[PDB]
Amino acid sequence: GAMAPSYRVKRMDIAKNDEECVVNAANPRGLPGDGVCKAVYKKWPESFKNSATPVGTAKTVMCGTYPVIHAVGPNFSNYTESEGDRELAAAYREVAKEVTRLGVNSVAIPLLSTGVYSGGKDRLTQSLNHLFTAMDSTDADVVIYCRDKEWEKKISEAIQMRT
Ligand SMILES: [Cl-]
Ligand SMILES: [Cl-]
Ligand SMILES: [Cl-]
């Protein structure tokens, strides 16, 4: 574990992370996809060997010895708000199980279901609170990656307000 487990947020490509493993915002079919998924495919394409997994689950595939945790958030275009919320919470619980199983001291994580799977809604708070619910009992340093300047500020505020 980290000596003083922390949350941090950085605004940059998660393909450039400084953590011991990465969470991919994956699709269920293990396809290169778009956004974070496409960045992860470009950086760690070896990790997409048998990475297909259902919605609400995470499946880790090693790129060399570097773990890529493929976490499949729901596409809110396809799910009802209720069932999408349930699957999004479940995907993060499976991320916390994998981070724990791997014994890493740090993990790079994007906000699941916030991009093209958002169904055109702002899900920063929904997705971040499910991240916290799952990761709070872990002792890994968690570094959240985002691209939007206003999201960085809002994530940073949510982190700092619980310290
Ligand atoms: Cl960047
Ligand atoms: Cl997404
Ligand atoms: Cl963002």
Counting ligands in written order, which one lies closest to the CA of residue 146?
3
- Header resolution in angstroms: 1.4
Whole-angstrom Cα distance, residue 51 to residue 144?
Answer: 22
Nearest CA among 123, 65, 44, 63 for reference residue 91: 123
Whole-angstrom Cα distance, residue 72 to residue 28?
Answer: 6
- Domain residue spans in the chain? 1-163
Rounded to 10 deg, the angle between the 81-102 and 124-135 helix axes is 40
Tell me the CA–centroid distance for residue 38 and ligand 1, in Å. 14
- Alpha-carbon 95 to chain mean position: 8
Half-sphere exposure of residue 156, counting CA atoms within 13 Å on the CB side? 10
Tell me the CA–centroid distance for residue 80 and ligand 1, in Å. 33
Q: Which residues pair with 145 in a beta bridge?
A: 10, 110
Bridge-based pairing of strands 7-11 and 22-25 is unpaired
Hey, what amino acid is at 22? V
Technique employed here was X-ray
Q: Which residues pair with 71 in a beta bridge?
A: 25, 58
Counting ligands in written order, which one lies closest to the CA of residue 14?
1
Hey, what amino acid is at 68? V
Nearest CA among 25, 100, 115, 102 for reference residue 70: 25
Counting ligands in written order, which one lies closest to the CA of residue 26?
2
Answer for the pair 25, 112: CB distance below 8 angstroms, yes or no: yes
Render the chain in DSSP notation, one character per residue: --SS--EEEEES-GGG--SS-EEEE--TT----SHHHHHHHHH-GGGGTT----TT-EEEEEETTEEEEEE----TTTS-HHHHHHHHHHHHHHHHHHHHHHT-SEEEEE-TTSSTTSTTS--HHHHHHHHHHHHTT--SEEEEEE--HHHHHHHHHHHHTT-
117 annotated ligand-binding residue: yes
119 annotated ligand-binding residue: no
